[PDB]
C-alpha cells in the first residue's frame, strides 16, 4: 500500500531508541514559518569526513572553510517535503519558549529518495554553528 508502510516503518524503527546507541541524534526542522517540526524517531546519522574547500560565498577569495556534512539514513517520508528547504538542527535544545538556544546547524545538501518508503539525506553544517 505505501501509506501504512511508512507509519509501520516509524513504529518498527522506534525500537532502535529503546536500545541505547550513540549514533542516534535528534533532528528538528522549521518547516512552518516561525515554529518547529520535529522528526518522530531519534534516527541515526553518520559523519562523512571533512574537506578543505574555498568559501561558497566567494570561491576565489583568501577565506577558506572546511565543509562538514552529516549522513542521515533512515528518515520517514511522513515529514513534509518543503521541510527540506528549511534549515535543520541536530541535537537542539528547546527552552520554556518556542525558540532553540543551542544545537548543530545544518542545511539539506543532497537528497537520496530511491527508497519509496523513507528518505535518506546528507545535510551540510553551516559555516557558523552554535555549539
Amino acid at each position: 500500500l505505501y501509506s501504512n508502510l511508512i507509519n509501520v516503518k516509524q513504529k518498527v524503527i522506534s525500537i532502535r531508541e529503546k536500545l541505547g546507541d550513540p549514533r542516534l541524534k535528534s533532528l528538528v526542522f522549521e518547516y512552518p514559518a516561525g515554529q518547529l517540526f520535529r522528526v518522530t524517531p531519534k534516527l541515526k546519522v553518520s559523519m562523512v569526513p571533512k574537506n578543505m574547500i574555498g568559501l561558497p560565498l566567494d570561491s576565489k577569495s583568501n577565506i577558506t572553510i572546511s565543509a562538514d556534512d552529516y549522513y542521515i539514513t533512515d528518515v520517514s517520508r511522513n515529514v513534509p517535503e518543503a521541510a527540506f528547504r528549511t534549515r535543520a538542527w541536530l541535537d537542539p535544545v528547546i527552552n520554556d519558549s518556542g525558540v532553540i538556544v543551542s544545537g548543530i546547524n545544518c542545511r539539506c545538501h543532497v537528497i537520496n529518495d530511491k527508497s519509496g518508503l523513507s528518505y535518506d539525506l546528507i545535510l551540510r553544517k553551516e559555516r557558523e554553528v552554535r555549539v
Partner: protein
C-alpha cells in the same frame, strides 16, 4: 592612523545611508524575506574580508620628516562582500530580479566611500577603487520552491585600495590586549631591543675655547685655552 579605527569608520560609511546590512557573517541567509512596513525585502549578509596587501613603502612624497619619529605610508586593500538572496517563490525568472537596483546601490556606496576622505580618517592620503564584480551565482544550498530549485544570489564585492599615514607612536599595548600580553619574554632568551625614547632637554652645558692668534684649529690641546664652562639654566649647577 591605526587600521581598526579606520575599518570601523569604513564599515560605518558602508552602512551609513546606502546598504542595509541585516547580518554580518560568512553564510548565505536561510531566513525568510524580512517584513518591514508590510513590505517584504530579500535577506542579505556582509562578509568583511581580512585586510591583505599590507605594504609599507616609505617612498612617497606625502611623508613628512617631522624629526620626532619616522613616519610611514601604508597601503592596504580592504575587501567587503555583500550578498543578497532572492527567493524563487516570488522571483520566478532571472530577468525580473532587481539587478539594476543592486548595481545602483553598489555605485552609490562606491561614491560615498570615495567622497568621505575627511570622514573615514584624517590621515588618509589616497582612496582608489578596484573594478567591482557582480555575480548572479546560485545560493550555497538554499532552495525556495517545488523541485528544490536553488535561490538567486546576487554577490557584489567592494575592494578599496587605500593609502594612509602611520607612525610608530600610534601603536600601544592597549590595541593588542586580547592577542598579545604587554612585556613578554624572548623566545630564545634574547634581550629586547628598546626603541629610541623622546629626549627632553633639561639642561645645556657649553665649554668654549679661546683659540690662538692665527686661526682656530681645535685638534691640538695647546692651541686653545679654556675660558669658561657655561650652564644655560643656573639651576643645572650642583645637579648633574
Amino acid at each position: 592612523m591605526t587600521k581598526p579605527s579606520l575599518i570601523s569608520a569604513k564599515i560605518l560609511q558602508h552602512i551609513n545611508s546606502i546598504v542595509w546590512l541585516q547580518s554580518k557573517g560568512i553564510q548565505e541567509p536561510l531566513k525568510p524575506d524580512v517584513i518591514v512596513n508590510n513590505v517584504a525585502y530579500p535577506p542579505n549578509v556582509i562578509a568583511e574580508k581580512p585586510v591583505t596587501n599590507i605594504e609599507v613603502i616609505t617612498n612617497s612624497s606625502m611623508i613628512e620628516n617631522t624629526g620626532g619619529v619616522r613616519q610611514f605610508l601604508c597601503k592596504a586593500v580592504f575587501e567587503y562582500t555583500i550578498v543578497w538572496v532572492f527567493s524563487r517563490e516570488v522571483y520566478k525568472t532571472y530577468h525580473q530580479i532587481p539587478r539594476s537596483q543592486i548595481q545602483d546601490l553598489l555605485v552609490f556606496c562606491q561614491q560615498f566611500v570615495i567622497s568621505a576622505y575627511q570622514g573615514i580618517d584624517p590621515d588618509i592620503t589616497n582612496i582608489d577603487l578596484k573594478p567591482s564584480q557582480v555575480l548572479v551565482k546560485p545560493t550555497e544550498d538554499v532552495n525556495s520552491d517545488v523541485s528544490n530549485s536553488s535561490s538567486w544570489s546576487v554577490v557584489a564585492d567592494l575592494r578599496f585600495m587605500i593609502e594612509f599615514l602611520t607612525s610608530l607612536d600610534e601603536f600601544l599595548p592597549i590595541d593588542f590586549n586580547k592577542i598579545q600580553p604587554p612585556t613578554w619574554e624572548l623566545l630564545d632568551d634574547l634581550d629586547p631591543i628598546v626603541p629610541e625614547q623622546p629626549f627632553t632637554l633639561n639642561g645645556l652645558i657649553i665649554s668654549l675655547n679661546k683659540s690662538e692668534l692665527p686661526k682656530v684649529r681645535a685638534d691640538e690641546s695647546d692651541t686653545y685655552q679654556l675660558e669658561e664652562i657655561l650652564y644655560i639654566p643656573p639651576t643645572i649647577e650642583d645637579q648633574i
